[PDB]
Amino acid sequence: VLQKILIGLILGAIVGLILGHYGYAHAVHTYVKPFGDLFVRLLKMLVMPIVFASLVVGAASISPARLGRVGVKIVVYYLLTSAFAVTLGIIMARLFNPGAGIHLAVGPPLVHILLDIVPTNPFGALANGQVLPTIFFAIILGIAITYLMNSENEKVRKSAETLLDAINGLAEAMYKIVNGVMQYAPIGVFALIAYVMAEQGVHVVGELAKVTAAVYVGLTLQILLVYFVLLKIYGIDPISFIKHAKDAMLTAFVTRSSSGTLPVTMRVAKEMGISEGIYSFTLPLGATINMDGTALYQGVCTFFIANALGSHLTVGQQLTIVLTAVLASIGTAGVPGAGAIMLAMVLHSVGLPLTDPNVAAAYAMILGIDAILDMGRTMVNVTGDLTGTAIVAKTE
Amino acid sequence: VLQKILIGLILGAIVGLILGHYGYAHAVHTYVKPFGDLFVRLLKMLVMPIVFASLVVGAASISPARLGRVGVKIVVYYLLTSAFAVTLGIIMARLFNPGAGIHLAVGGQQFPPLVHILLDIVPTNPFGALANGQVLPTIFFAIILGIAITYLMNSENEKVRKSAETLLDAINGLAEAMYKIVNGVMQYAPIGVFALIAYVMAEQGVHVVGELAKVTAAVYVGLTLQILLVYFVLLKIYGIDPISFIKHAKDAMLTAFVTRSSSGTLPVTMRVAKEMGISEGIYSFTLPLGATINMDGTALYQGVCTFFIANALGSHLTVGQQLTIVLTAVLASIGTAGVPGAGAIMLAMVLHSVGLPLTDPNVAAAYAMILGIDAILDMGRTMVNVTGDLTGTAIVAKTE
Amino acid sequence: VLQKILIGLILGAIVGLILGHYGYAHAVHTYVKPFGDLFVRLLKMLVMPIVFASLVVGAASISPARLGRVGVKIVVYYLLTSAFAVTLGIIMARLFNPGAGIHLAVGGQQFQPPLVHILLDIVPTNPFGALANGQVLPTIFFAIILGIAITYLMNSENEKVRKSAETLLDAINGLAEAMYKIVNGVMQYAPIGVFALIAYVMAEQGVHVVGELAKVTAAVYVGLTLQILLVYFVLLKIYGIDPISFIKHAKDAMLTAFVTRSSSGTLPVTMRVAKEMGISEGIYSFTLPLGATINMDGTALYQGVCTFFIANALGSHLTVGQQLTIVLTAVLASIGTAGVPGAGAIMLAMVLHSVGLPLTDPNVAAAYAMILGIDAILDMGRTMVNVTGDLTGTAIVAKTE
Ligand SMILES: N[C@@H](CC(=O)O)C(=O)O
Ligand SMILES: N[C@@H](CC(=O)O)C(=O)O
Ligand SMILES: N[C@@H](CC(=O)O)C(=O)O
Ligand code: NA
Ligand code: NA
Ligand code: NA
Ligand code: NA
Ligand code: NA
Ligand code: NA
């Protein structure tokens, strides 16, 4: 069964939590966290081909619409889900008030980012991660192929259908393998939370426990208040959605890599019957743009620091968190650290840099339990993609 | 229309030239030169696949000849076109005499095994070579693959011949698809172009005065006379209509001028070779090769710079052994890469050949004057570097 | 003919040996060793595709067995071949006793991996990366996984799935095939390539094989010869395969491996000898690349006979007892040692700190620098046996399945 995951997740959360309370953070890290990393190694392996392949073959569907409309749909969808997510985490940090005790001890060109979506060598872009420029190209290829196939010349249309196939052969094959790599997941998962529990979990106490609640409640309320709602309204069964997306949420949670989860996310989109036309473009894009769980986490962390330091958090202009949280979320990468790291950009937005070494002394507190906040946050980052995809998949 | 390029090129050259006279070199650079770079990003994207694919499928044609003869032809073609080009630039710099005023201010200054270059043509990992630019080793391998494919298809075993034809197809699928795209990316060209000369005009253009204007003339007149005196002529004699050639190569010459990347123009140069009906067997090998070997417009620029410096410093430019420019210019040209600066950079090698290095900090004070308007000289020089590939390809395409 | 190789190897060994006795180590290196390197460049070129392709198509054959059994077989084969090889080189260095004269001159001086963070590295994180940056091993791991997913994709109820899948599998074979076509052409260069390659090593390190260095060399090559006759010829004979047909077939791989000293660079030529002696891509296209970095038999001997050379010149008792700890670590070091044309030297260090005599104690570091003075001589021999052991094992296991 795939409750062997929950058997691993629960057993591991427990076995983990215990062993780290007894100073064996290092019996774990040296002994258990390779099996958790192995699992990840595998899932990374599949991300590059599965993404490329499935997007070329996902330029099956209509050039100007689908893509055009679907992009714009999903983009618009993504923005509002994220712009909401922070506001929800603002409200969570006005509710829980994480910062009384005084912070104890002390001690990119934007444009030259947009241009970087258009690769300069697509084999480069392939061989060095780089989902986003890959996406951009994989699309352009898959479209040129469509047009090649409706050529009058039938040597053109011969080879073109040829190519398009092998590419699908691959995309398909990746999907075949994401099934096998899921067998490891119970062990993979067990080992992964075993670590984070026996490590940062035995540190979630006092005001750190306070902030953690303010996050995860916010994350829960993102789902029920936004996803379940937006699903319900759009006529899709929320509860069927969860049942199907169980596998991606668990990987995303446990891995904390949105980008690492992508194959498993994409195979959940396949096996809930959406078109490669949609999912194979919305998913990778969203996998780095729709960080809903980050925008909450960042909105609730800006507050945590500005409370321990005791600014008024502008009773007025804290929309400039909301704004910058969005912006930072969009920027934050899909690796299992960067929301912390990027939180900085929404901090210098509220005017409290990691230079004023009390700020830097709270932020370092936060960072002490990031991988805890990460799991939750990540899982919601991914879910937001599936929701959005699914919603837009039903609109088209 | 593709006169929207000329509408962009002329509007941009003007809008540019003006704004840079009014100290807005930075309103441009921050606001207009991304659109120009976007265009380039795109064209870079295509170069790697288009080059690889088209050459494997361009090992359609006859193994020993075609390739063999065509290589040798185009190589021989390339050498003499370049060896001429410098001599034409020598004559331009004896004509215009760019160096009376003494290289005034001093102080603002500047800092390969040959064999371990030839060996570097044979790649050690063809996916490496692919994923890291590297046209030349790619070419080498793409050929070798394209040939092994031909031979695989005439195998007695028909599972061998099944899969082989299969592979060769998808590869063509791609090569084809790239060509489809170089058509789309051409749509951007008018904006792309407008922005790209908007920059160079509003930047180094408002600096082309006095003896800098003098050297520019002696280059561009030399570049014009490379066309009329060598291309138009070598085209006419070989029976191809010059004026149909220019009409067809209007797109590659405009990209190359505006981009200044020989190598970045390659897809558009290769889709001009296709749509003037030459064989992938020829063009998909002569074009990439020449795109980094047949720098004619460089060898002129370098011959006419060596003279500009040795005039401002006032050496006799050896009344006798300035053939050692001619020789080294060739050698430098061959070497100079297809990126949008290196003719300047490489000019150094022909300077230390005439015996005046960038150490003697008056030399390095002229050479830094030159470098002040290089992108002006680059547009010109680059366009001629590409044209010379088309000319030679076309000429040799007609001989075979 | 392919005796134009032997005509080049012999002419070159001679022309080389002579010119380096007359201080023209640099007339050679500047003039002859490019043609030797060109040859290598080419063979490198083919390695990546040939390996990848042939393994995906090599996941023709049965998923659970073949692979399963063949792996375990070849793995088990490999261990014992190597574990023997050192013991043979132990015995060679008890026989020839290379270390009387005290390590003269001190002051040559060199400096001094997480295992688990090696195993994890076999599973690539981006297969295009792995491909584009050498990295045979993770490539293997993935190429298999691909080739198997392909097999299963082809027996799908959906026949659009089974359409494109067979499509893909074909082009991949188109390539594999095409590489093999080319390893034939690149063999044409071999006589020149070979001539130039030994021309170098002879006119360079060969005019240095004198005295105790000649002593150790003998103790190596005799050990290497006796690895063949005593182990290969034997294990071949017993398994019913004709040794002398095997040698006839593997003549081309052995000569490249010897002359190139790159086990990994020889791989196309080795893999095309496996093809043209009629083994399945199912076997050879997995056992050959794996072994090309794991089955270093000629290394484990060289390393066992080098530990002894140094421990003799320094005069330790070489533990009359626990020198099995060489045997053990030599295996481990052999397994680790890469297929590039130096690393047995470099890795010998790990079996030295195992016997407790590091390159810090600068007389150790003054012997090890003597060894290294003639490594490329020991390398040719050692390497060729590293490859042979792959063919032997492949062939043996190829006949078992
Ligand atoms: N690990 C997170 C990123 C973050 O920490 O912000 C994710 O992939 O969603
Ligand atoms: N940018 C030129 C090189 C040069 O300026 O010499 C070209 O690529 O053609
Ligand atoms: N050159 C050897 C490695 C070594 O010298 O240990 C080989 O490839 O087999
Ligand atoms: Na996401
Ligand atoms: Na993000
Ligand atoms: Na050129
Ligand atoms: Na050049
Ligand atoms: Na080996
Ligand atoms: Na090894």
Query: Which DSSP string corresponds to A371-382?
Result: HHHHHHHHHHHH
Closest CA to A45 of A139, A142, A173, A187: A173
Residue B7, CA distances (Å) to A24, B17, B182, B256 in order: 72, 15, 20, 17
CA atoms in the 13 A half-sphere facing the CB of C171: 21
Helix residue spans in A130-206 (DSSP H): 131-149, 156-180, 185-200
Closest ligand 1 atom to Cα of A374: 5
Number of A–C residue contacts, CB under 8 Å: 76
Rounded Cα distance, B169 and B179, in Å: 15
- To 10 degrees, what angle do helices A258-270 and A156-180 make? 110
Q: Which residues of C106-134 are buried (b: 16+ CB within 10 A; e: fewer)?
A: eebeeeeeeeeeeebbbbbbbbbbbbbbb
Distance CA B156, CA B172 (A): 24
Alpha-carbon distance of C106 to C101, in angstroms, equals 14
Nearest-angstrom CA–CA distance, A30 and B49:
44
Task: Please spell the DSSP secondary structure of C93-149, one letter per residue.
Answer: HHHS----S-------------SHHHHTTTS-S-HHHHHHS--HHHHHHHHHHHHHH
The number of C-alpha atoms within 13 Å of C241 and in the hemisphere containing its C-beta is 25
Give the number of the atom of ligand 1 that is nearest the alpha carbon of residue A377: 9
Measured by CA distance, the residue closest to atom 6 of ligand 2 is B343
Contact residues, chain B, for C142 at CB < 8 Å: none
Please give the Cα distance from C266 to A278 (Å, whole number): 46
Structure tokens at A220: 């829960």
Phi-psi region of A316 (alpha: psi -120 to 50; beta: other; left: phi over 0): left
The best mutation among B204, B370, B378, B379 to test binding of ligand 2, ranked by most ligand atoms within 8 Å of the C-beta, falls on B378
- Planar angle of CA B127, B132, B133, nearest 5 degrees: 110
Q: Identify the residue whose tokens are 């005001």.
A: A207
Residues 6 or more apart whose Cβ sits within 8 Å of residue C221:
C381
Give the phi and the psi of residue A7 in degrees, each rounded to 5: -65, -45
C216 contact partners, CB below 8 Å, separation of at least 6? C96, C98, C305, C306, C309, C371
Q: Which of A120, A127, A163 sits opposite B41 (nearest CB)?
A: A120
B303 lines ligand 2 (CB under 6 A): no
Between A37, A45, A169, which is nearest C153 by CB? A169
Distance CA A388, CA B231 (A): 59
End-to-end CA distance of chain B: 34
* Range list of H helices, C22-97: 25-31, 33-57, 67-95
Q: How far is CA B358 from CA A385, B99, B351, C20, in A?
A: 58, 17, 8, 40
Asked if residues B201 and B59 have their Cβ atoms less than 8 Å apart, the reply is no
Closest atom, ligand 2, to C-alpha of B295: 9
**Best CA proximity match to C252, nearest among C229, C234, C275:** C275
* Count of alpha carbons within 13 angstroms of residue C366, beta-carbon side: 11
The number of C-beta contacts closer than 8 angstroms across A and B is: 75
The chains found to touch B (3+ Cβ pairs under 8 angstroms) are A, C
Q: Say which CATH number the domain at B249 has.
A: 1.10.3860.10
Contact A178, A46 (CB under 8 A): yes
DSSP character string of C181-218: HHHHHTTTTHHHHHHHHHHHHHHHHGGG--THHHHHHH
Q: How far is CA A24 from CA A34, A195, B140, C30, in A?
A: 16, 10, 57, 59
Report the residue numbers after which chain C has a gap, meaning the C atom sits over 2.5 angstroms from the next written residue's N, or none: 112
For residue B96, is it left (φ>0), alpha (ψ between -120 and 50) or beta?
beta
Helix axes B250-259, B33-57, angle to 10 degrees: 130
Task: State which residues form the domain around C58.
Answer: 1-401
Distances (CA, A) of B224 to B88, B297, B340, B387: 10, 10, 20, 12
Which residues of chain C have a CB within 8 Å of the CB of B164?
174, 177-178
Is B169 within 8 Å of A156 when comparing Cβ atoms? no
Residues 6+ apart with CB under 8 A from B67: B59, B61, B143, B281, B285
**Cα–Cα distance, A106 to A129 (Å, whole number):** 38
How many structural domains comprise chain A? 1
A373 Cα to the center of ligand 9, angstroms: 43
What is the b/e burial string over A187-201, where b = at least 16 CB atoms within 10 angstroms of the residue's CB?
bbbbbbbbbbbbbbb
Q: Say what the alpha-carbon torsion angle A367, A370, A372, A373 is, to the nearest 10 degrees.
A: 120
| Residue in C closest to A35 by C-alpha | C120
Asked if residue A377 belongs to a known ligand binding site, the reply is no
